[PDB]
Amino acid sequence: MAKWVCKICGYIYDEDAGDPDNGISPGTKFEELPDDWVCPICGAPKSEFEKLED
Ligand SMILES: [Fe+3]
């Protein structure tokens, strides 16, 4: 699946890993994350992530 980078801190949201410490099971697409999910490192909102692909 895809990877998305936080443009603030460099955290990479990996859809294969999810974010299970914050309620997100592995295999959850970025578009499926709750509207109030934020970067687990810096707190940036979803708007500040970019998909890693051309
Ligand atoms: Fe961040």
Swiss-Prot record:
InterPro entries: Rubredoxin (IPR024922), Rubredoxin-like_dom (IPR024934), Rubredoxin_dom (IPR024935), Rubredoxin_ET (IPR050526), Rubredoxin_Fe_BS (IPR018527). Its cofactor is Fe(3+). Residues 2-52 form the Rubredoxin-like domain. Extremely thermostable, being unaffected after incubation for 24 hours at 95 degrees Celsius. Fe cation binds at C6, C9, C39, C42. Keywords: Electron transport, Iron, Metal-binding, Transport. Pfam families: Rubredoxin. GO terms for molecular function: electron transfer activity; iron ion binding. Binds 1 Fe(3+) ion per subunit. GO terms for biological process: alkane catabolic process. Rubredoxin is a small nonheme, iron protein lacking acid-labile sulfide. Its single Fe, chelated to 4 Cys, functions as an electron acceptor and may also stabilize the conformation of the molecule. Belongs to the rubredoxin family. NCBIfam families: RubredRD. This is Rubredoxin.
